[PDB]
Design an enzyme around this catalytic site. Structure first.
Site, mmCIF file in Angstrom:
data_model
loop_
_atom_site.group_PDB
_atom_site.id
_atom_site.type_symbol
_atom_site.label_atom_id
_atom_site.label_comp_id
_atom_site.label_asym_id
_atom_site.label_seq_id
_atom_site.Cartn_x
_atom_site.Cartn_y
_atom_site.Cartn_z
ATOM 1 N N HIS A 62 0.874 -1.216 0.000
ATOM 2 C CA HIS A 62 0.000 0.000 0.000
ATOM 3 C C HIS A 62 0.896 1.246 0.000
ATOM 4 O O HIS A 62 0.819 2.073 1.010
ATOM 5 C CB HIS A 62 -0.974 -0.028 1.191
ATOM 6 C CG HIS A 62 -1.961 -1.145 1.144
ATOM 7 N ND1 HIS A 62 -2.925 -1.249 0.141
ATOM 8 C CD2 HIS A 62 -2.194 -2.162 2.005
ATOM 9 C CE1 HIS A 62 -3.678 -2.301 0.377
ATOM 10 N NE2 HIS A 62 -3.241 -2.896 1.514
ATOM 11 N N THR A 85 -7.786 -2.931 10.183
ATOM 12 C CA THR A 85 -8.677 -2.192 9.244
ATOM 13 C C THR A 85 -9.237 -3.167 8.198
ATOM 14 O O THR A 85 -10.473 -3.161 8.014
ATOM 15 C CB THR A 85 -7.994 -0.970 8.615
ATOM 16 O OG1 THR A 85 -7.160 -1.391 7.538
ATOM 17 C CG2 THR A 85 -7.169 -0.186 9.607
ATOM 18 N N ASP A 86 -8.392 -3.999 7.576
ATOM 19 C CA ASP A 86 -8.872 -5.070 6.651
ATOM 20 C C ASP A 86 -9.717 -6.098 7.411
ATOM 21 O O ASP A 86 -10.668 -6.598 6.807
ATOM 22 C CB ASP A 86 -7.756 -5.835 5.937
ATOM 23 C CG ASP A 86 -7.298 -5.249 4.615
ATOM 24 O OD1 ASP A 86 -8.135 -4.646 3.902
ATOM 25 O OD2 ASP A 86 -6.117 -5.421 4.289
ATOM 26 N N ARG A 98 6.861 -5.526 5.009
ATOM 27 C CA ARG A 98 5.508 -6.064 4.730
ATOM 28 C C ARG A 98 5.358 -6.177 3.211
ATOM 29 O O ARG A 98 5.261 -5.145 2.552
ATOM 30 C CB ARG A 98 4.408 -5.185 5.347
ATOM 31 C CG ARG A 98 3.060 -5.896 5.462
ATOM 32 C CD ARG A 98 2.190 -5.697 4.236
ATOM 33 N NE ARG A 98 1.671 -4.336 4.146
ATOM 34 C CZ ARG A 98 0.594 -3.845 4.810
ATOM 35 N NH1 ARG A 98 -0.099 -4.595 5.654
ATOM 36 N NH2 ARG A 98 0.215 -2.586 4.635
ATOM 37 N N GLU A 147 -6.141 -10.950 8.700
ATOM 38 C CA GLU A 147 -6.950 -9.761 8.339
ATOM 39 C C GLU A 147 -8.217 -10.138 7.543
ATOM 40 O O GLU A 147 -8.735 -9.256 6.875
ATOM 41 C CB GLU A 147 -6.042 -8.764 7.611
ATOM 42 C CG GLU A 147 -5.083 -9.335 6.574
ATOM 43 C CD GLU A 147 -4.301 -8.243 5.853
ATOM 44 O OE1 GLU A 147 -4.549 -7.063 6.155
ATOM 45 O OE2 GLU A 147 -3.416 -8.579 5.017
HETATM 46 MG MG LIG Z 1 -4.304 -5.182 5.230
#
Ligand SMILES: [Mg+2]
Ligand SMILES: [Mg+2]
Ligand SMILES: [Mg+2]
Ligand SMILES: [Mg+2]
Ligand SMILES: [Mg+2]
Ligand SMILES: [Mg+2]
Lengths: 249, 250, 249, 250, 250, 249
Positions: free
Chosen positions: F44, F169-170, F69, F144
């Protein structure tokens, strides 16, 4: 107008360079030496796609065949490198006939494979291209696991690939030995001689990664079709270590 | 904590340095981790632009050697940006006059000793808030002697207080003297000129360095008392190593 | 505050550019012409991720919708491009309903798909974003194989995609014909007309890659919803060839 | 083996060159493979920095054209780094005086004819160990005439031995003469000035070139006897090609 | 349509600007979209080379702020290339004399008012074919005052017609006055010198700006009547934000 | 000569940074703060491989452990990052035991996994390397999705991984809630407490992504082994928003 490695084979073995270091200047200089090809390593290096692209151009200008050892046997990765003017592909960790078919499928247009058509750099080199496109590219499946060793006849039965390329340090490690450069571990030496025997029996090419000119001399004398020697980083570090020792003597 | 070349000099010993014409971080860290006190990045003759030099300086520093840059040109604002990127040694090519040596010196020291602009992004991370007090000591600065002009002006170049000394460019010096631009030359006039520059540097209580193409030649320069010896360019060592591997393989 | 291509459709077809050349300057200049979108080709070009990222920004500033034709139908690749401000995705070689589902899964947050949440660039453009996020993105599955042609109704039944995008040169090659730019091979013309017929029958959009304004004029008149014309490299080479001919006349 | 523009000139024929304002290797090779003798990379008006020019020179050389660079500025050390990167032609903008033309000439020749620093990374790969003896002949150097000052100083600019001649910047020249900066202008005073510069170049036994925006205008300049004609910028040709495809599609 | 800083100035209001020492497009767009009228990219103290600045200018323009560059040096050809890349504000460091201020002014205006080379790649996309007539108005140009020399020459620097005014470099100015190079300093002599430069700028009908390290200090400079206030560097704000998150977490 | 996070664990939790912005300068500066590790987000963000490579060097010099990540749980991607000197891997969207096995297979040489041997940067750091290579690297599977939540005991049974890393959040979005930063949605809080409970019951590590020092303080007090706080972009935007508000007050 020809693949320099295929020209060797149509006459002799090919000797190739091996780059772990990104950049154009050493790539061109090594290409102009008596190497038939220079392999760029995208597996065990900081070289991404944006860095490999100009190195392929530098190798071709030097007058050696630009090869890539890919990060993985991924068809779409392999296709984008062929359209950027990689004319040799070595795919790591090819363990089964299905995996060798996946490699073969990337190297050939339909009907022989499923290679996507958009040959940006090969159309500039070859002008005629489509009619000879499969011959412009050399494909080798890496044998570097006990599984790949067991499946050697399966892998060599795949049409579409020219042959196999031995990763001796990963083969030694997967067989439970030290990951030694130019390993002479008796079991690993046996496995390598078996792979070379089965490749030549199926009318296919066999190549091998070497860490030294000495080891590469022996592999050429053993009848390997494609010998790489030695990584730019390994040759540079050893040369610098000797220069420092001579300076400090 | 300290400039590793200045630490060599303070402990009575010369510095041996590597020399990079190939861009990238992996060989820069690998050579820095060898028994080199410093590694020089060449921004004059190579394809190394500012974007490519910045991560190389980091990579040399991680390997344990002092990161040096041989700049494209003796330009103050180019030099200051490299200092602020963590270049801890500066070698300026084609320094021919006292005035040009003063131009180099001006880039290397904050007011009141020079006119270096204050914004030390990477040195403030390495040295902390005490950086200003010791900034001048953290940087090594050498003016290159590569012309008949520079050879004639050696004493006035050596009188400039804000440079550590001089660095011989022996291929340019050989060429400008009318001889073959061969590294590690035996040409008697070039050999004479090199010895002359070392003797004058040492008489003026300054350091002298020289670019070498071989370990054997570097050994001799070290025995002659050179303070800063470079040996040998990554591209030259790599090229020679490949020709030998090929020769042995074939 | 809207997808420019979706605005066309809510009113008309969209005409799009097509970039094979990396860089911001031509991308901005072409975006400011009367193109509704500009597609960046990551399949058949030297454009890696680091190169595509600033081109998406350049296209948006020019005032066209930034599209990417991806190297492969890979969900995580597609997600990273959406979070970098690609607002159109064309996935190559979508041959089955399962493959069309994999594309649809990347384009939508849960519950409609599995798109990972971290919309770095869309959150800056849209501010409200999550509530409209699916509408901000256009998704098209490429039809360019005899397998994709046979599975057309399967592929068009997938909710989550807007429709299909014809790759006529790869479709011609996979059907055993010459990979001609703007091919009019009778079997290939039939297959394309069939794909357009089935897309409109299922209430979905159909797009097509064109090599010329002439071909693109005919496709727009045939009722294609999304027409690309023509690659920057192809237009530039043809213009340079004509400039040289005029100079040397 | 030889500079392809100098080979044109030696065989009594002009050179036609491409003109790149867009960075990248793919169009640079594609245009080099067309019937262009040279391809000029523009480092003045474009987003092409040194990192982006280096692989472009390689790509043009592979396509079969002579790689040229129109530099940002007439700066000796910038010019020398481009020569060592395999730029085989240099076009320096805004050369207004004999002194500035001599500054350009100085960058292009090794001692004793100029002061070019010796470290020819890419030319030594192309030309081999015999490079020094023929270095000057491997490089083409043109001073740009784009001001009323340069027009007034044309004869003294043309007296400098170490440049091949001049290259008209016709939009800057039109603007500085008080006219619209239009490429391929019909403006009588600009047309007159361009003819004047060609006549003076040819009277001094030097080459003259001109930047063109069209094939038609380039044809006329070639018939008028221009030695080095550029036509036309990649961004201009691409933009015009896209507007026509759009017009035809809609 | 218009330079957003000049629009502020025309409507009787100051401009508040961001300040980037970190390369990249994502934070440049994110900060541009905040209530900043302009965002300055620092090419002096940072690792931002030309290749890295070019996409950042695009990203700031998309976010809605005016893209500015504080150049490495007051060099005309570097400035012109940034203008042609869509830098719409130029802040030149270490402008010490009327002559240097005239050198800056010369880069910013086409003939006959300066000597800017015509090739406006990005401004011609933003402004269209009417660009030449309004080019000068689309660009804001400030000379930096960071030395005792510049402070002594303030009136003659301010007499140059082709610059909008001056921009205080307060850490360099503090250092050159013999004080700690602290941002937002309370040191009475530095405070006095800053007030003096603003008063002289405003007496000469020119703009004055200042670099700030904090929102609180920027508020005061805005109340004192500074025309162009920067607050605060992305790396400084990020570093302080991380130390607080860490402190709160531990 | 040790993994800084493993040293914490052998004694305490690790606090880590989180980078969405490419470049070396902020990466080094944040590494020198009181962070045990700095995680570089390749999912992201605009960070490609060529951009991540020098950031890993910058983090190590600052004296924090370089973590990545990844965009996806892809073995060959993970291997190339380990050979570039990533000493921590967080793989997103690990939903099943098979997926956790795929992650574990990348982190270990044979016989414990199939990691390919070419440790360009780790061989320079460690010199001895092969004998300790598994201990030099920390591996965490991201939880997630509701599927990952259901399979938690399956995923934690995989040897080769150190534990799991929660993407809150996911996880909130996949459970049908708002994708809120540091979400306290009662169902999501329950799921997170369950994941932490099951990780500690199986003798494994649990980590969590935080958007604030406040949230990270609570997670450390709850006994999470690895806490990240907070994204560089998020901290920078909030700081700039406060600086502007103070300037305009
Ligand atoms: Mg995520
Ligand atoms: Mg291997
Ligand atoms: Mg020299
Ligand atoms: Mg296709
Ligand atoms: Mg001009
Ligand atoms: Mg300052």
């Amino acid at each position: 107008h020809h693949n320099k490695v295929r020209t060797c084979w149509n006459e002799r073995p090919a000797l190739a360079g091996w780059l772990q270091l990104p950049g154009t200047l050493h790539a061109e200089a090594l290409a102009r030496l008596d190497y038939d090809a220079v392999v760029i390593d995208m597996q065990h290096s900081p070289i991404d796609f944006g860095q490999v692209a100009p190195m392929l151009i530098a190798i071709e200008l030097g007058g050696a065949e630009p090869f890539v050892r890919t990060q993985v046997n991924d068809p779409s990765d392999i296709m984008k490198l062929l359209d950027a003017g990689a004319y040799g592909i070595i795919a790591p960790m090819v363990n089964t006939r299905a995996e060798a078919q996946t490699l073969a499928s990337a190297l050939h247009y339909s009907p022989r494979g499923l290679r996507a058509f958009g040959p940006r750099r090969p159309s500039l080199r070859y002008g005629g291209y489509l009619a000879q496109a499969s011959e412009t590219v050399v494909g080798l499946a890496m044998i570097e696991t006990r599984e790949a060793l067991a499946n050697i006849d399966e892998i060599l039965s795949v049409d579409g690939i020219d042959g196999v390329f031995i990763g001796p340090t990963d083969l030694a490690l997967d067989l439970g030995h030290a990951p030694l450069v130019d390993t002479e571990e008796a079991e690993v030496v046996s496995a390598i001689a078996h792979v070379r025997e089965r490749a030549h029996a199926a009318g296919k090419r066999v190549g091998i990664f070497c860490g030294s000119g000495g080891f590469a001399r022996v592999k050429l004398a053993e009848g390997f079709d494609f010998v790489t020697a030695a990584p730019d980083l390994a040759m540079l570090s050893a040369a610098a270590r000797q220069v420092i020792a001579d300076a400090r003597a």
